[PDB]
Design a binder for this molecule. Structure first.
Ligand SMILES: N[C@@H](Cc1c[nH]c2ccccc12)C(=O)O
Length: 353
C-alpha cells in the first residue's frame, strides 16, 4: 500500500468518525492532491520525515473541545528517493494549492527564495498542511524551517522574513517571547495561505531544558494563560515531571499589530513521546487532564482507536503532542497523532534529527 493511500484511508475514517460530512470528503481530496507527488512510494521509499518523530511524513490533529469537529493534517513534501532537504517538492506544492484551491501565495512568494534555498543547512525545508471544520472551507498552511541557514541563524532568518513581509515593526513580539537567551529559540515560521484578515503568521519556539515555571512565564504575557493552570497542565501531561529535560516544550505566537482577546494569540504544545513509558500511559494522562469534559474524551478515544495500529503499551510514538490554548470558559486542546509507519518509541528530536 502506498503511503498516500494508507494515510488517505485513515484520514477519511477519522473524518467519518468526527461526522465531518461533505467537508470531510473535500478534505480527503485535498490530502490526496497534496500527496500525489509522493507517487508510488511505500513508507521505505521516502526519506525519513520530520513531521512525526518516528519519521512518518504525516501527522493528524484533532480538536477535542470544539462543538463542531475540526480536523487537520500536516505533511512533508518529498520526492521518492531524494533527500528531504531537496526543495523541489516544497516549491511545487504552493502553486498546486494556489491553482487548485485558490490558496494565497503572496506571503509565501515574498519568502520562498530565502526559506526554501537550493542547499539548505538543515535536513528538512518544509511542511504543509490543511485544516477543516464541518461546513466551512478548507484552510491551508505552510511551515518553513528557521534553521535552513544554520542553527545560529534562526533569529537573523526570521528577521529577514519580516523584512520581506514589511512587518519588522513586529520584532518586539519575537524579542519579548525570549526569556532564556540561547534556550528559547524560534525554529518554525508558519503562514496561513489565505488572503483574509483571519490569516496568521506564526513563530514556533522551542524551550530547551525548561522548567514548567519557565514555560508558564513565557506564556503569561498572552491573555488567558494563567500560570497556575499552565503549570498544572504541563505536570499532568508529563506524569509529574517538572522539567522538559530532553524534548523541548514548544510554544507559538501569532505576529499581530494589536492584542487579540479571542485568546488566539499563542499556543502551548507539550511533546508526548519521551516523557512516558508508552502510549497507554499517555492515554491515561489525557483522561486525567480532560476529566471534566467527557464529550471531549469520547471524541479523543474514538479518533485514537482509528489511528493506532498496535497495543498502546508497546511503546511511545502514536501521540506526538497535545496543545493548549485558553478559551472563554474552558481550555482549547488538540491532540497530534502519528500513523506510525516506522518504529515504536522514537528518540528525542525524532529519528531524522
Ligand atoms: N515533529 C516536528 C515538527 C512538528 C510537527 N507537528 C508539530 C507540532 C508542534 C510543534 C512542532 C511540530 C517537531 O516536533 O518539531
Amino acid at each position: 500500500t502506498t503511503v498516500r493511500d494508507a494515510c488517505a484511508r485513515t484520514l477519511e475514517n477519522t473524518a467519518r468518525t468526527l461526522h465531518l460530512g461533505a467537508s470531510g470528503t473535500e478534505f480527503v481530496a485535498a490530502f490526496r492532491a497534496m500527496t500525489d507527488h509522493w507517487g508510488a512510494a511505500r513508507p521505505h521509499d521516502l526519506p525519513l520525515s520530520d513531521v512525526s518523530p518516528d519519521g512518518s511524513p504525516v501527522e493528524y490533529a484533532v480538536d477535542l473541545g470544539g462543538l463542531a469537529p475540526a480536523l487537520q493534517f500536516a505533511m512533508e513534501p518529498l520526492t521518492a528517493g531524494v533527500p528531504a532537504r531537496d526543495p523541489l517538492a516544497a516549491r511545487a506544492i504552493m502553486p498546486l494549492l494556489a491553482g487548485r484551491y485558490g490558496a494565497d501565495a503572496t506571503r509565501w512568494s515574498a519568502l520562498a527564495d530565502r526559506l526554501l534555498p537550493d542547499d539548505a543547512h538543515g535536513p528538512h525545508v518544509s511542511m504543509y498542511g490543511a485544516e477543516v471544520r464541518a461546513g466551512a472551507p478548507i484552510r491551508f498552511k505552510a511551515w518553513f524551517y528557521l534553521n535552513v541557514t544554520g542553527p545560529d541563524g534562526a533569529f537573523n532568518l526570521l528577521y529577514s522574513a519580516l523584512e520581506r513581509m514589511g512587518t519588522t515593526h513586529l520584532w518586539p513580539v519575537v524579542q519579548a517571547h525570549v526569556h532564556r537567551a540561547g534556550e528559547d529559540v524560534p525554529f518554525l515560521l508558519s503562514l496561513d495561505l489565505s488572503d483574509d484578515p483571519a490569516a496568521r503568521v506564526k513563530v514556533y519556539f522551542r524551550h530547551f531544558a525548561a522548567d514548567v515555571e519557565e514555560v508558564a512565564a513565557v506564556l503569561k504575557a498572552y491573555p488567558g494563560f494563567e500560570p497556575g493552570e499552565v503549570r498544572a497542565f504541563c505536570k499532568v501531561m508529563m506524569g509529574g515531571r517538572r522539567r522538559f529535560s530532553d524534548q523541548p516544550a514548544v510554544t507559538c505566537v501569532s505576529l499581530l499589530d494589536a492584542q487579540t482577546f479571542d485568546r488566539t494569540a499563542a499556543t502551548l504544545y507539550v511533546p508526548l513521546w519521551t516523557y512516558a513509558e508508552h502510549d497507554g500511559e499517555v492515554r491515561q494522562r489525557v483522561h486525567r487532564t480532560l476529566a471534566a469534559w467527557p464529550e471531549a474524551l469520547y471524541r479523543y478515544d474514538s479518533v485514537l482507536a482509528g489511528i493506532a495500529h498496535r497495543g498502546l503499551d508497546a511503546g511511545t510514538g502514536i501521540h506526538n503532542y497535545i496543545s493548549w490554548q485558553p478559551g472563554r470558559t474552558r481550555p482549547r486542546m488538540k491532540v497530534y497523532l502519528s500513523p506510525e509507519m516506522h518504529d515504536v518509541t522514537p528518540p528525542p528530536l525524532g529519528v531524522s534529527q
